Design an enzyme around this catalytic site. Structure first.
Site, PDB file in Angstrom:
ATOM      1  N   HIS A 170       0.776  -1.231   0.000  1.00 21.17           N
ATOM      2  CA  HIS A 170       0.000   0.000   0.000  1.00 21.17           C
ATOM      3  C   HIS A 170       0.795   1.260   0.000  1.00 21.17           C
ATOM      4  CE1 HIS A 170      -0.005  -0.221   4.606  1.00 21.17           C
ATOM      5  NE2 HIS A 170       0.217   1.068   4.439  1.00 21.17           N
ATOM      6  N   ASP A 184      -0.808  -7.876   1.617  1.00 22.28           N
ATOM      7  CA  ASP A 184      -0.295  -6.502   1.534  1.00 22.28           C
ATOM      8  C   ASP A 184       1.222  -6.354   1.478  1.00 22.28           C
ATOM      9  OD1 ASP A 184      -0.191  -3.672   1.362  1.00 22.28           O
ATOM     10  OD2 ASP A 184      -0.825  -3.300   3.410  1.00 22.28           O
ATOM     11  N   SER A 203       4.612   2.214   8.651  1.00 20.87           N
ATOM     12  CA  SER A 203       4.360   0.932   8.025  1.00 20.87           C
ATOM     13  C   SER A 203       5.671   0.255   7.728  1.00 20.87           C
ATOM     14  CB  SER A 203       3.594   1.095   6.740  1.00 20.87           C
ATOM     15  OG  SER A 203       3.144  -0.188   6.358  1.00 20.87           O
TER      16      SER A 203
END
EC number: 3.4.21.90
Lengths: 158, 158
Positions: free
Chosen positions: B35, B57, B109
């Site tokens: 992402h 992901d 992240s």
């Protein structure tokens, strides 16, 4: 709710019954801090005679056989990172074991600080507040088994 | 001038310079969360043909024979207790990796959560504000090597 697992942590009650500290069962012995002046809440372990040790601020006695097996384990080796006690995480950053401010207090001595594997690593005795965090006074043990008693400047015993 | 600290945690920058996420050399490959759409900031790695896995992901690429030596190690064995990450302690109590409310953030992240012994335990993806704590969205590998992605209701990707 059946509690089918044996206690290894016990309460040190005064004459009223208020819990003023803790005793634990580790490495073949029942052991609580000498400065907590109270009785161990257990029918068997209270009639035992404890050997004082001012040097280490400790009292101990050997556990009655059937209990010796269901007792903790200590690990001399312990890396920097995070460990866990009753009120959450405990940090280790070069010699000092620290928890947040206003978390530990009177009654918490004798509580172990342990790892995610469940082996004991230190024993709390009291703690030195430092505005932001609290530097704990522990009783650790080395590779050889020599009792060390780390104590930060300005410790209020718990 | 020399660098003795191995190369494991790379930054992922956008098309304006800001750091939006991270990536890490682990177990034979570079890894980053899908992402985060930006360029890994590292000459060799950024010019490698990545492979996506949208169900998890992630988007991985194999490590050049040389860097293979200094990548992270993973551990599927992660008991309940406290862990380490960039901003501090990360609690693991039955499925969830929670952290104190606040410290999460966009840019966080890709960051790994790791045990006291340095081995990686999970790669962070985003957080779900559950009041006092925050339940993290993470990737982890089970006892048999297969990927698993735990994602809380309300998760905000980072």
């Amino acid at each position: 709710a059946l509690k089918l697992e044996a206690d290894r942590l016990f309460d040190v009650k005064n004459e009223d019954g208020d819990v003023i500290g803790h005793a634990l069962a580790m490495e073949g012995k029942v052991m609580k801090p000498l400065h907590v002046k109270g009785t161990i809440d257990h029918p068997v372990l209270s009639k035992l005679k404890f050997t004082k040790s001012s040097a280490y601020d400790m009292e101990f006695a050997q556990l009655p056989v059937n209990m010796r097996s269901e007792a903790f384990t200590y690990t001399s080796e312990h890396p920097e990172g995070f460990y866990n006690w009753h009120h959450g995480a405990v940090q280790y950053s070069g010699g000092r074991f620290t928890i947040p401010r206003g978390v530990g207090g009177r009654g918490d001595s004798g509580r172990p600080i342990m790892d995610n594997s469940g082996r004991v690593v230190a024993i709390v005795l009291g703690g030195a507040d430092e505005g932001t965090r609290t530097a704990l006074s522990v009783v650790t043990w080395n590779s050889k088994g020599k009792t060390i008693k780390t104590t930060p400047e300005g410790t209020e015993e718990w």
